[PDB]
Design a protein around this ligand. Structure first.
Ligand SMILES: CC(C)C[C@H](O)C(=O)NCC1(CNC(=O)c2cc[nH]n2)CCC1
Ligand SMILES: [Cl-]
Length: 410
């Protein structure tokens, strides 16, 4: 059973929908700025990718919204955009065949931090009654199903940077194997609180380029110093092909492959050859029935880390051989930063749009490619080119790897 993309939705540091975000991507625009919503003078990193000007009231009543952490509000916004974009009418004849898989890396950290402050100052009577339902990761899937009447498979992944990739891949598996005809899948993140910036800062994971936030995210650049923490959400409507065809749906692209692997190497550090990423990409290509030479575009994991970026080049060279010099690969995290559990979702949308528009997004900030970083990394400016097959990679903490493969639809 074939799986197509019929609807997409997004909040990112570049825009409050897909068209606005993609316009930013193609123009080489950074969404990274000093963070406004808290005082970070004690933190080593004081900048990130925030969602600008979000109005939850476009999606939910002020009543419903006050009960939900920002990561849920973001996930719901993306989901509602995707469902609307799909044109699907939910009925009694199909509602059991429509499910949801929206994940998060960290979930309701802001809500946890604020409730923790009330707990320590006052005691447990100050904890919100909506604290649990409004903070737990599966409540994007939960609330979406309730609002739209979706009675199909209902779950949530939490796999760090791989969350959105795994969410989409496993949703596509549900449709492929007949457990559902439609799935809303992707991920959401809002970890820009004291615990998030302080936590990743304590692990020395973040860029500390406070003087030039728009230059901080620089995948494959010799002066990269860690990732940029970013917020938002991505959602796709995945649909069985015959189901989509029958209702006259607009098909953006086909989801042809999903691969997974584990490094089984280290908690935060990748193998220097990227062997786990290599296995993952090969698993996805095998799943899609594609040779490496059929790949035209890779949306890289490319988080702007010393070890991670070079390991991904190594894995691409291993998988693609001489064809590694013919494909284009870029990291849109150059512009968006690292959306953690949303990264795979937004990057899947950017991969589908590279197929729609026949354009490889840039890697901005790639001033001085490091040793070995000699592929077409689409430095600086978008590249019009032929793109039949687009791959999206995500490699998360714990060495958990996921690859999606999208194809132009015939
Ligand atoms: C986090 C930092 C302090 C340490 C380190 O520099 C880093 O970036 N580790 C990244 C992980 C994700 N994996 C990859 O990037 C990757 C590339 C090729 N194959 N895997 C390994 C587990 C997280
Ligand atoms: Cl370890």
């Amino acid at each position: 059973r074939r799986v197509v993309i019929t609807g997409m939705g997004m909040l990112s540091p570049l825009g409050l929908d897909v068209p606005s975000s993609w316009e930013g991507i193609l123009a080489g625009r950074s969404g990274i700025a000093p963070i406004e919503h808290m005082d970070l003078s004690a933190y080593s990193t004081r900048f990130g990718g925030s969602v600008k000007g979000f109005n939850v009231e476009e999606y939910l009543s002020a009543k419903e919204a006050r009960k939900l952490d920002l990561f849920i509000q973001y996930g719901l916004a993306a989901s509602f955009q995707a469902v609307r974009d799909s044109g699907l009418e939910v009925t009694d004849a199909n509602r059991e065949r429509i499910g949801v898989s929206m994940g998060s890396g960290i979930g309701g950290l802001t809500n946890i931090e604020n409730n923790c402050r009330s707990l320590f100052e006052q005691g447990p009577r100050r904890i919100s009654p909506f604290f649990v339902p409004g903070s737990i990761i599966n409540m994007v899937s939960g609330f979406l199903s309730i609002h739209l009447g979706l009675q199909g498979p209902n779950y949530a992944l939490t796999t760090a940077a791989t969350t959105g990739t795994h969410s989409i891949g496993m949703a596509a598996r549900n449709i492929a194997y007949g457990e559902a005809d439609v799935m809303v899948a992707g991920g959401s993140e809002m970890a820009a609180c004291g615990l998030g910036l302080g936590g990743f800062g304590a692990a020395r994971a973040l860029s500390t380029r406070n003087d030039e936030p728009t230059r901080a995210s620089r995948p494959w650049d010799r002066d990269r110093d860690g990732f940029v923490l970013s917020d938002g959400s991505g959602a796709l409507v995945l649909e069985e092909l015959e189901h989509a065809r029958a209702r006259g749906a607009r098909i953006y692209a086909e989801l042809v492959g999903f691969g997974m692997s584990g490094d089984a190497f280290h908690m935060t550090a990748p193998p220097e050859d990227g062997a786990g990423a290599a296995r993952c990409m090969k698993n996805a290509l095998r799943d899609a029935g594609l040779d490496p030479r059929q790949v035209d575009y890779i949306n890289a994991h490319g988080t702007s880390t010393p070890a991670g970026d070079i390991a991904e080049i190594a894995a691409v060279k291993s998988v693609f051989g001489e064809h590694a010099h013919a494909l284009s690969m870029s990291s849109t995290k150059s512009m968006t930063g690292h959306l953690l559990g949303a990264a795979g979702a937004v990057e899947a949308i950017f991969s589908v749009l590279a197929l729609r528009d026949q354009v490889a997004p840039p890697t901005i900030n790639l001033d001085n490619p490091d040793e070995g970083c000699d592929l077409d990394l689409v430095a600086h400016e978008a590249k019009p080119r032929k793109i039949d097959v687009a791959l999206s990679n995500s490699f998360g903490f714990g060495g958990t790897n996921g690859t999606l493969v999208f194809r132009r639809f015939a």
